[PDB]
């Protein structure tokens, strides 16, 4: 359910601090509005209002219309702006990171075994892996800057 992992889910850039603060403030205020308000419809005390009204058939007609149906400021799920953006973000940020993590793990596993293995039989092969490991260090610095 993560304040511990939700605030550190972004990258090294500080541009996501404004978007993460707006989503956390709207989510906390939405839960407090539903808990402070009553989860019932309406009381409509018509047992003591019909006999105490001055005009005849005044409180009885207003109680039948208020207990039926009325209008509210609601909307439907037709304007799914964030639903279409969530699927497109997974193909450019989540799916693209899978190929980068697979190439980084395969290059690091081959460089660890070549650095510990001799100097004529398994050397020329270790020199080729050392060139890819040296280029990986420059690519990692270019991806962070």
């Amino acid at each position: 359910l993560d304040w511990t992992k939700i605030v550190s889910k972004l990258g090294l850039s500080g541009q996501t601090a404004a978007a993460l603060t707006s989503f956390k403030k709207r989510n906390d205020e939405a839960k407090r509005i539903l808990f402070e308000l009553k989860q019932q419809p309406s009381n409509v005390d018509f047992a003591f209002y019909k006999s105490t009204l001055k005009n005849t058939a005044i409180v009885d007609k207003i109680q039948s219309d208020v207990s039926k149906f009325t209008p509210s400021k609601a909307n439907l799920s037709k304007q799914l702006n964030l639903i279409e953006s969530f699927e497109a973000k997974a193909l450019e940020n989540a799916k693209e990171t899978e190929s980068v993590v697979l190439a980084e793990l395969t290059d690091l596993e081959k460089t660890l075994e070549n650095i510990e293995s001799x100097x004529x039989x398994x050397x020329x092969x270790x020199x080729x892996x050392x060139x890819x490991x040296x280029x990986x260090x420059x690519x990692x610095x270019x991806x962070x800057x």
Partner: protein
């Protein structure tokens, strides 16, 4: 760092759809509760003044 960012990007992109869905669903519940409380307060004020 690349493996940690790959798992975090999948959770951050999936949370964008759930964040707007929770706020849109809560807006309809808050508007329906405020409209029902306003009609109950208007009927109770007219009943208390008539009594």
């Amino acid at each position: 760092d690349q493996v940690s960012n790959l798992k975090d990007v999948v959770s951050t992109t999936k949370a964008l759809f759930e964040m707007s869905k929770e706020t849109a669903a809560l807006e309809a519940e808050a508007f329906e509760l405020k409209q029902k409380v306003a009609v109950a307060s208007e009927a109770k004020s007219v009943l208390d003044s008539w009594v």
